[PDB]
Amino acid sequence: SDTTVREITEWLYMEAELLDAGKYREWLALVTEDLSYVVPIRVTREREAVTDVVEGMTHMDDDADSMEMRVLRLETEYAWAEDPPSRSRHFVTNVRVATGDSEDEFKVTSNLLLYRTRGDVATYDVLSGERTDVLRRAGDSFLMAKRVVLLDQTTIMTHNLALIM
């Protein structure tokens, strides 16, 4: 690819920079009208078994309307889960860019280490996962058509998933 790597990689850093800054509405300018943002459930199974990932159920399964509600909720001044806001850092590493099912689409895989902290108590949360995105072209930048955050946990180590990954 090259230079599309430089451009997708810097998109993923700008997306993270918006998310850790609390600018969710500005983040929503990314994403596509047919967005699919899903966070699968995982369960401990043996190596033999076909798969780890639960089918039919999810931690978060948004389209663009439902994702717009999620941001709409946070723009209200009664979003207690985040109204003294979290301190998050999205650590986007291991970026792997590869061509898409169509032209101008790219399957963009990253490793995420989300670091979450909540107000003055001396504890922190760490979510580790792998996002598998589909970045469409839109103008001289990209738009997110789909994301699958597959976390490295079965029992999730945060009290809620109020942060976008």
Binding site: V43, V54, M57, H59, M60, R73, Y78, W80, A162
Partner: protein, 440 residues
């Protein structure tokens, strides 16, 4: 070991729960309360484990808990429901280290003792070589969960062998569980797997929330009231009912205002309201005809939610069922295990729409439940200092106004509105009764 100070404050509370209508705050975040609660409440009461539809065929198992105790809940090769303790008889290793699956046998990794999913030890490696056939297998089978029973799908378990049968324990609540579980011929189904996550909040706070807290909808879920996903009318719960049973149980039913027209029954598919009209008592159907929210807890830590709610800010509401465990991890920690159930014979369109109403409102990433988990986790924080544990929780809503409903057509103590805390007081009363009980 109840200490002298805890016994005294439990007794003072048992007095205040019916007279002052408050409860001692020391009961939320105490290491001492928690350890006593391990034996007194969770070591006797009927705790939920799995739903029968999680394990349909032979061999299917799930690994579930009563407090720290890990139990394989499975359907053995003879077809029956079993609840084995997940600790080998030899040296106490996990015979199963998955959380879900399907297996005929359970081979223990340490030495090799193979168990059927039936429970009985079938094979000991080196029977002649090591033990010289002198090992009697029948006496070394996976400890059966002392008391095991299901109610219309719901596999409850208890650690006390001399406890009331599960049907007696649920008692008059069975009437209300039915309007939620017994609506269709094919039964309810648990879709996929529960969401399992860790809140840093004492379990009783979530359990307290579902028994009869509709009052909170307007401040904590104010974000959702603004988006049109929660009832905008500040007196929406007043069109409701406040029922409770003995054994700490209790629920709350809310329907829509007299004018506001909402489909009969929660808008459930044409094909299942036909089945529910004949499956439920003629009275039960009339209670369920107008209802739009049903929220309750089946004592210890299982809560039911049957809410008519929207999947986003632009969609009409659709109904969803959810069962959830407030699993106690410590004094200031729980693990939510939130299930989502739907009628088997319901259309795929409704199965899909009902699941998106659950997801976007309740569960780990819900717009409703994520604010609930922030409130509970903060109560627990502050309720962990000594000057705070000195104070008291206020449950005085309705004092000198709560008149039992003469017109109510179902069992238990009902009140003719949903802004009440008589459910939560009764829940804590049974909590306290079981706490002090020197003899079960």
């Amino acid at each position: 070991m109840l200490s002298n100070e805890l016994r005294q404050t439990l007794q003072k509370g048992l007095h205040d729960v019916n007279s002052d209508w408050t409860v001692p705050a020391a009961i939320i975040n105490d290491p001492e309360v928690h350890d006593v609660e391990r034996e007194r409440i969770f070591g006797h009461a009927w705790v939920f484990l799995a739903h029968e539809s999680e394990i349909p065929e032979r061999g299917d198992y799930v690994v579930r808990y009563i407090s720290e105790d890990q139990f394989i809940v499975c359907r053995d090769e003879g077809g029956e429901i079993r609840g084995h303790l997940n600790a080998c008889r030899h040296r106490g290793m996990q015979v199963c280290r998955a959380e879900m699956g399907n297996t005929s046998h359970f081979r223990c990794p340490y030495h090799g003792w193979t168990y059927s999913n039936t429970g009985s030890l079938v094979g000991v490696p080196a029977g002649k070589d090591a033990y010289g056939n002198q090992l009697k297998k029948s006496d070394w089978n996976l400890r059966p969960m002392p008391n095991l029973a299901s109610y219309k799908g719901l596999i409850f378990g208890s650690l006390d062998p001399h406890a009331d049968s599960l049907e007696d324990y649920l008692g008059d609540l069975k009437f209300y569980l039915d309007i939620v579980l017994d609506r269709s011929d094919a039964g309810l189904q648990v879709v996929g797997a529960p969401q399992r996550w860790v809140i840093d909040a004492n379990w009783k706070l979530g359990a307290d929330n579902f028994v009869g807290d509709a009052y909170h909808t307007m401040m904590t879920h104010r974000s959702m009231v603004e988006l049109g996903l929660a009832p905008p009318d500040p007196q929406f719960a007043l069109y409701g009912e406040h029922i409770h049973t003995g054994h700490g149980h209790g629920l709350g039913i809310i329907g829509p205002p007299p004018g506001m027209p909402l489909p009969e029954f929660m808008g459930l598919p044409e094909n299942i309201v036909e089945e529910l009209e004949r499956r439920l008592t003629p009275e039960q159907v009339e209670i369920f005809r107008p209802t739009a929210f049903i929220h309750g807890t089946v004592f210890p830590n299982l809560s039911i939610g049957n809410f008519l709610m929207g999947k986003d800010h632009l969609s009409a509401p659709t109904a969803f069922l959810t069962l959830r465990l407030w699993h106690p991890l410590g004094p200031d920690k729980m693990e939510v295990m939130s299930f989502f159930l739907v009628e088997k014979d319901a259309p795929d369109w409704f199965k899909d729409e009902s699941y998106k109403s659950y997801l976007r409102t309740f569960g780990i990433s819900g717009g409703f439940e994520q604010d609930d988990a922030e409130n509970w986790r903060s109560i627990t924080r502050v309720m962990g200092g000594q000057f705070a544990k000195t104070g008291e929780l206020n449950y005085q809503m309705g004092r000198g106004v709560l008149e039992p409903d003469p017109n109510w057509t179902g069992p238990g103590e009902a009140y003719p509105l949903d802004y009440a805390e008589a459910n939560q007081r009764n829940f804590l009363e049974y909590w306290m009764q079981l706490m002090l009980a020197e003899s079960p």
